[PDB]
Each structure stands twice: as structure tokens, then as C-alpha cells.
């Protein structure tokens, strides 16, 4: 979640029915637009920011939210246009004996500005005397790895979280029938009625 992967999605048709009707995404709600209503509205740039967090702070991925991930790792802005998909991933990410590949930023001088990606792993100074990048008292490495175990509870299981953000080449689809000949039809071709 500190190095959250962002991929820009554009110049395509975005079919959201396979997302909402997948029946596998446990946490899913949408801000600024209804999830069944965004299928037939068109945006310009779509960013799919994706990361892995513990199941407790899925609530931290929300606009106007204060916490640890929402301040030092990944902050959503208050005017967030888009939405968040989080599903359980205990069967893949929590390996036997502990999974320590996933780390989160724990110590930081200031809270993050929205959509900031912080990659620096400098030894954080919490006190007055600087300690030149060596480990010690008031010298904390800011990335504390999650302890992910299959023994862990539901709140401690890893949840793969994908965050969609929206802003005109990004959209849904349609049709209806066959073409109808030699009968009075009040047709609709591309919008022309």
C-alpha cells in the first residue's frame, strides 16, 4: 500500500457488469455516482489504484477519513469521484508461516496529500538529534511489514483493494434487438431519434 500500483485506463469500453455482478467482492460502495448508474456515463481518464491492506482498515479507504493508511500510506481526497473494490484474499496472499512481502508506511513526518505515492525508505527521525540513516533510538524504519497468517482472524486477513478514480474515451455499451425493416419503428441510432 505504500507503493500502490496505479494504472491509467483509457480508449476503451468499460464494462462494469462483470464487476458488480461478480458476487465475489465483499466491500463495494460508490461515491459521487451510483454503481448501477455509472455504466452508461462516460469519463475521460480512469485510474485503477490497487494495493493489499489488512481487513480492518478497508474503512480507512474512504473520502474524509482519518487513520494510519488514510494518512501515511494512501489518502483519498474529499472530492473523490470513483469507488473502491475490496475482496478477501486469504487464499492467495496469506501464505503458511507468515507473509511479510506487504509493508505499510507507519512513521511519517506529515500526512499525505491525496493520490501521493511515497517510495522513500529513509530512516525516520522522531527526535531532535538526527541519526544519519542508522537504526537506533528515535531512528525507525518507516515500513512495518504485515504479519499475514491463515490462522489470523477475519479482520486480520489480507484484502486486495482496487480503487477506481474518475475524471472522453472511457465508457459502457448497448444495443437491444435486430434491425427492423418495412415497419414503423421509432428508432435510436447512436443517439439520433
Amino acid at each position, epitope marked *: 500500500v505504500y507503493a500502490w500500483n496505479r494504472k491509467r485506463i483509457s480508449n476503451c469500453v468499460a464494462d462494469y457488469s462483470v464487476l458488480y455482478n461478480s458476487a465475489s467482492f465483499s466491500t463495494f460502495k460508490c461515491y459521487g455516482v451510483s454503481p448501477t448508474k455509472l455504466n452508461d456515463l462516460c469519463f475521460t481518464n480512469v485510474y485503477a489504484d490497487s494495493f493489499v491492506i489488512r481487513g480492518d482498515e478497508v474503512r480507512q479507504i474512504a473520502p474524509g477519513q482519518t487513520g494510519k493508511i488514510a494518512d501515511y500510506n494512501y489518502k483519498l481526497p474529499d472530492d473523490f469521484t470513483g469507488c473502491v473494490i475490496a475482496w478477501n484474499s486469504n487464499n492467495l496472499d496469506s501464505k503458511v508461516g507468515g507473509n511479510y512481502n506487504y509493508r505499510y508506511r*507507519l512513521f511519517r513526518k506529515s500526512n499525505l496529500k491525496p493520490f501521493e505515492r511515497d517510495i522513500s525508505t529513509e530512516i525516520y527521525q522522531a527526535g531532535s538529534k538526527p541519526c544519519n540513516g542508522v537504526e537506533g*533510538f528515535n531512528c525507525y524504519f518507516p515500513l512495518q511489514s504485515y504479519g499475514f497468517q491463515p490462522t489470523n482472524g477475519v479482520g486480520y486477513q489480507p484484502y486486495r483493494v482496487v480503487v477506481l478514480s474518475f475524471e472522453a474515451t472511457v465508457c459502457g455499451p448497448k444495443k437491444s434487438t435486430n434491425l427492423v425493416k418495412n415497419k414503423c419503428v421509432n428508432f435510436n441510432f447512436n443517439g439520433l431519434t
Partner: antibody
Amino acid sequence: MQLVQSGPEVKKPGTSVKVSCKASGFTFTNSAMQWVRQARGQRLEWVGWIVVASGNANSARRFHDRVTITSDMSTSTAYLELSSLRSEDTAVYYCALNHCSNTTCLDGFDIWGQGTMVSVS
Amino acid sequence: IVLTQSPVTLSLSPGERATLSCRASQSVRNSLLAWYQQKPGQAPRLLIYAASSRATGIPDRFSGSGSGTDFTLTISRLEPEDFVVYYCQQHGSSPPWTFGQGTKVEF
């Protein structure tokens, strides 16, 4: 701004102790508690220290394998359990905390506990 | 890294000038030799932090001076309640944030 510590535990040379130390008046930030063991009539010693936000404990060399110094941010506590509780362990155990003034932290273990007469009988 | 302190008792009169010094055997990194006092059998409390600075809430009459290995605790005005065992710190190194032997401020 006070560290309420648990009461005394009269124990046996085969048992193990469990010393807790709750922080009252505030919550644990990146505060770096240390633990000080004082045998009566001797100098203060050093057991180990927890970065409370991270949980990275680190114990002293004579205590390298038989004390685990754990912390819990949810209850705003920080624990200690010492193994095998020998006859040369009858002491008073002090949980010392570094005060963090949000914007930063201090460089001194200013707020302490009150003691825990861990008796080995 | 071990820390040796200097005279094991300060057996001299109240109400005058006394000097307390911690002669470290290895050079203290980043000058972190905080000074504590501990009246016998009760909780210690902090006087000097970062080897020179006066602590918050603590009044005057104490002074930490110097850095590195040469070091001084400067007590100005020995009241009767300052006749206490006084302690070093080395919480700067890594492990064994070694204390001192202490001393005895004695009448």
C-alpha cells in the same frame, strides 16, 4: 501523562512473570518505551525496549532469549513476560516512556511507571 | 559499551557547589547521556535530556554540559532533598543503554 503499572507478583523459581504497564491520560504514538529492572540495593539495569507503534522489541544480552516485550496499541498497553524467573530476579521493574509532542518526540525517558515487586520465592 | 561514573559518594556539606561527571569508556554517539536521579526504593525521574537540555516541568539548579565522552552534571544549590543517588544513561548506542553505578550525594 502517567504510566500505571500492575501490582506485585509473588512467584516461584520455575514460573514466569507477566508484567503489564498501561498508559493513562493519552494514547501510544511512536513513543519507544523501555523497561528497567532494579534489584534492591543495586543499580538500575536495562531489560529491553519496544517501539510501541512498530512492536520491534529488542532485549539486552543477558536477557537475550527469555524475555518477550510485547505491546498493544488497541488497549494502549505494553507488556513484559520474563522466563524461568531465577532467584537472582527479585527486583522492581520500571516502564519508562519517551514523551512524544506530536510534531516530534523527545529524546528522554521522562514519564516512568511506579514499579512491580516481582518476588522470587 | 560500558559507562563508568565518578566519585561514588559526594560526602560534603549541603548548600554549596557540587559537580557530577560520567566518564564513558567508549564514546557516546550523538551525545545521548541523559541524567536521572532515584531516591532509594522509589521511581526514578528525569532531569537532563539529550545530555545537556533541562527537562520539561523540572525547575532550575541542574545543568548538563559537554558532549562526546567528557561530561558534566552541574548541580548548583544542594537542598536536603537533593541528597539522592544520581544516574547516567546511554540510550544512544544500540543495545545495553548502559546506566552508571550511581553516586551518593551525602551530608
